[PDB]
Design a protein around this ligand. Sequence first.
Ligand SMILES: NC(=[NH2+])NCCC[C@H](N)C(=O)O
Ligand SMILES: NC(=[NH2+])NCCC[C@H](N)C(=O)O
Ligand SMILES: [Fe+2]
Ligand SMILES: [Fe+2]
Lengths: 341, 342
Amino acid sequence: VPRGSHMMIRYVDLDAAEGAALDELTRSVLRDHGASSSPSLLDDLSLVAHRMPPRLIRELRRFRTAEEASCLVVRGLPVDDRRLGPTPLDWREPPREPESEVHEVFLTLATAHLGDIFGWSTLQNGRLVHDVLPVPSHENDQSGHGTVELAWHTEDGFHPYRCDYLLLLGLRNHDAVPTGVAGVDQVVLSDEHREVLSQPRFLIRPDTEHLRHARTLAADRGSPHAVQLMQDEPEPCAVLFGHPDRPYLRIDPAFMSPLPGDPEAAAALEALTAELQRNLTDVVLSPGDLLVIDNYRVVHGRAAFKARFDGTDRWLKKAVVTRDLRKSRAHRKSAAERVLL
Amino acid sequence: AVPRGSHMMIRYVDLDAAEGAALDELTRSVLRDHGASSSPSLLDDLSLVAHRMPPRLIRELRRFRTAEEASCLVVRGLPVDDRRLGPTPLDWREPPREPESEVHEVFLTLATAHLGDIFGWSTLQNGRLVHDVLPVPSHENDQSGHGTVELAWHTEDGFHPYRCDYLLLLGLRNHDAVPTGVAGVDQVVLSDEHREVLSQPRFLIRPDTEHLRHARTLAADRGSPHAVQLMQDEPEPCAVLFGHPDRPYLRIDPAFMSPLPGDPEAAAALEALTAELQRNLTDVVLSPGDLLVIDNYRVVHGRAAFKARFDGTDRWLKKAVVTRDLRKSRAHRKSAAERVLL
Ligand SMILES: NC(=[NH2+])NCCC[C@H](N)C(=O)O
Ligand SMILES: NC(=[NH2+])NCCC[C@H](N)C(=O)O
Ligand SMILES: [Fe+2]
Ligand SMILES: [Fe+2]
């Protein structure tokens, strides 16, 4: 480290036949299995996912395995703006048209080539595919439902079982609102700072949205919620981890701080923060664009924009993947279930 | 959630003639095209090539890792020609007389694709991704796959935090029907008192002798102590039961572990669990073409005493190990893509 800027993002452009094959496959699969989250689809996910165009499978497998580019941008998925229908005003509200579920299938199949798709009880009702869109009364939130600038972060950076890969699929983005991404492989940083960041001298806390639902889940249940405990008594942890010659990253400026009375930890963090800010790079998700982010090597944010709440607003589908679901067994209700409690 | 019945432990799958012959054809052509069972051309495209296997076998493997019901899967029916196989090598270092066994190595490597990430150890069989399990002269008394005395049951590489999630053993030759012993944590009768003690870091699990032999060599060559050596000298205290306490995972290796010194509760709880696993130990005989997939987080395995002749007719298995996440061992690997631990 550091590696060059061109190495960070790899672009794949699907041709017409590949795009058409995916459109046909995903509609047919939705028809047969009933839903993008269907148990019948999940039980057979690998098999169905290997009916996708071979070149996409190879690109996805390579991206995961070789660990070269930290972001994979796949463009060319057919998306019809009319058939898609208006953007829902809330993730809770069902869409006018069933069309967006076809593209949820695409996302769900893509996860098979990366690892185990999973969800959170404390986000969108434990759904395996999220809707990223603006929601009234959340304009000022640091979440996917805000309109104020979304500070860049590791996805669920606080949680030890946060995702390995984050998938964002553009469905509608008329105003070309960019997603910011910066890679730990591109960071210039002193050996002094790296060693401090590699020690457990930092407290990273859950974000507003997780806590909102954690509070009500502890009410409906008897027991306290692990997420609530992570806010109140966060365990000290490292920001850089893995192999020190090319480490992985765990960071969330808006919901973290160094240990108190630890100036070298604070200085190291601001030094790392400044670099990630410097190398922040815009990726505009157009309809059909899939962005695969290595959540162990990348931070991402999203620019401020103006929501209209009139059916034309920015709309993404989102899925998270863990390379090993079994490591979160103690936070799940049974071995096979994919939602963390 | 525990204990479960013995009937739930082992699931048998019998391949039919068409499935067997399709696998024989597939693995032969894969070997031809890719040049070796461990070839980088094969490994880079492994899931695509693995998905050319018969769909019922793919579904049985995928369900086995996802459902986590049965803790052992026995797939029978892989064609294995005893004559074309040629004589069992006298050591894993000796190349076999015939190239036939590498065809079955390919079956094994392909099977791993549906369970997770195949990996290896620098300190075992020179970092090979598929091992040979067979008796070697001078090692009759070893607690390894090369011994002929009773192999005490254990979690595979129990000492290591990045030990495998799944262990695959493929029978090639076993004329005298030597049984592989298996016992599952799901089937054990244990008190809550013992379970609590076993869930705390009050046990020291150390590497087996085979690991350390090679670690000592690699230490002198690289010019620094090997991680495995440190694990032998200063083992970090760890729990024998982990995961969810209602249906826990198991990490144990009696022949290479001890309870914390001066800890009689740890000593007693370990002895209780040990005696219970011993009572529930179940014989599975691997005949030619029998694949045994073991969940290493829920099962211990051993092997009965037998007599080796070292005349080319002795018991011979192929072996591979799978981790559900290769990335977690990054700090003990040379680079991100490298599949062999340092
Ligand atoms: N600083 C952060 N962690 N920002 C992202 C929060 C995203 C939020 N958990 C959501 O589901 O929309
Ligand atoms: N008690 C044990 N850990 N026994 C198994 C040792 C297996 C040995 N590492 C081998 O490669 O053959
Ligand atoms: Fe995010
Ligand atoms: Fe073993």
